[PDB]
């Protein structure tokens, strides 16, 4: 199937500078505009740049405009965005997305069809700190679950059971502590009679940190 | 630069109901006939955009029949004929007659159902916790409707104020449910002072408390 896998995000300092990718797969990837979208904390989508196919023409926001540069390698099936300069504002989750066949004399829209699964850039001044995970311990249900405490920037992922433990669930969003670094709990409802026999996992990942950890809860 | 706005951005709707969700756009959007640049696209929590309508009604691969666009011009409506629970999420318009392309502010799609008490679960600070100075004691609220509930933290019989911090899921796509995890922030000393902690999540006039005790 078509996909868009982005890479690039994490902290970098107010006037500092980073580079996006996303590689394509599943199309004809020479043949279409390719384009980013942001999202801010809590905040809305918007369009931040384009490029087409060929890489003939280019298209920026206004607030970006000369700070930013996108581009692309078709060759490697990749673009890319050269984030300079950066701001407060820049702060956000970016997506690429697949946008109109450039190839054909009349462009063909089909709107912005495959979305990448993002990336976060922070603009901050502060330093990357890696999470503590902490258990959260033990009706017919019992409830445990994971504590990531004192993490930046954003964002941490959890699953359980390396992916198998999917349904009761529950991942709540982060939580920006007084200390200016973030929390998040992440739990889950399972059967008291399994608590015996089953393992419970939960499986941290801080990408901005290199932190990997997977700790089971007794 | 074209300016989009929506109509409503909360959407409470019963599942079966229809739901409609209105674009406007500052300029017109009609390339040409049969050709106006106007996209629906759905993000629900904690995943990417999907496209639902392209070109004002074209519907994208795999979008089921319920949804539908129409509207010309600088008038759009997204219909779902009939809600399910799992379309909740935020829908958003966008045009693609310009750069910059530009989006609506977001509709909120809210499920409503009937009133649901949340199971109450309590958690002391693990040992591995413990051994670094800091104390957390969590509690959970797990699958309650509606969204407005307090939660008190009590620490002795004390009252707590400005030491809790909470947050919240969105709506489970099967149940409609919300689930809140409190999280109270004691220093380990504090923490080894007293002995019954309590989180108290009142609905209404009704309290629920969950207890433990340190010692």
């Keep these: 199937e078509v996909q868009l896998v982005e890479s690039g995000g994490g902290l970098e300092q107010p006037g500092g500078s980073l580079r996006l990718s996303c590689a394509g797969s599943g199309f004809t990837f020479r043949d279409y505009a390719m384009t980013w979208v942001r999202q801010a904390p809590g905040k809305g989508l918007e369009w931040v740049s384009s490029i087409s196919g060929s890489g003939g023409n280019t298209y920026y926001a206004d607030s970006v405009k000369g700070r930013f540069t996108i581009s692309r390698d078709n060759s490697k099936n990749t673009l890319y965005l050269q984030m300079n300069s950066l701001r407060a504002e820049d702060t956000a989750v970016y997506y690429c997305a697949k946008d109109r066949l450039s190839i054909t004399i009349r462009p063909r829209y089909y709107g912005l069809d495959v979305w990448g699964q993002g990336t976060t850039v922070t603009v901050s001044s502060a330093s990357t700190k890696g999470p503590s995970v902490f258990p959260l311990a033990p009706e017919s249900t019992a409830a445990l679950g994971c504590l990531v405490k004192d993490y930046f920037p954003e964002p941490v992922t959890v699953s359980w059971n390396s992916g198998a433990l999917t349904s009761g669930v529950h991942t709540f969003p982060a939580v920006l502590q007084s200390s200016g670094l973030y929390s998040l709990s992440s739990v889950v409802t399972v059967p008291s009679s399994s608590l015996g026999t089953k393992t419970y996992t939960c499986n941290v990942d801080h990408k901005p940190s290199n932190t990997k950890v997977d700790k089971r809860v007794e | ?215």
């Excluded at chain 2, 070109?55 to 994208?60: D, F, P, V, Y």
Aim: a neutral charge; one cysteine or more; aromatic letters at 10%.
């Design chain 2, 1 to 215: 630069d074209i300016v989009m706005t929506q109509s409503p951005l909360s959407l409470p709707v019963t599942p079966g109901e229809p739901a409609s969700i209105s674009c406007r756009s500052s300029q017109s959007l009609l390339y040409s006939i049969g050709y106006n640049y106007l996209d629906w696209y759905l993000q629900k929590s904690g995943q990417s955009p999907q496209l639902l309508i392209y070109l004002g009604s074209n519907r994208a691969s795999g979008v089921p029949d319920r949804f539908s666009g129409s509207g010309s011009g600088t008038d759009f409506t997204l219909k779902i004929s009939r809600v399910e629970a799992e379309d909740v999420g935020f829908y958003y318009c966008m045009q693609a007659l310009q750069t910059p392309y530009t989006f609506g502010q977001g509709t909120k799609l809210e499920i409503k159902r009937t009133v649901a008490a949340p199971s109450v679960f309590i958690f002391p600070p693990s040992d591995e916790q413990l051994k670094s100075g800091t104390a957390s004691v969590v509690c959970l609220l797990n699958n309650f409707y509606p969204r407005e509930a307090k939660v008190q933290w009590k620490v002795d019989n004390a009252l707590q104020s400005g030491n809790s911090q909470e947050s919240v899921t969105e709506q489970d796509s099967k149940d409609s449910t919300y689930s809140l995890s409190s999280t109270l922030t004691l220093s380990k000393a504090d923490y080894e002072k007293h002995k019954v902690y309590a989180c108290e999540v009142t609905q209404g006039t009704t309290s629920v408390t969950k207890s433990f005790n340190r010692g």
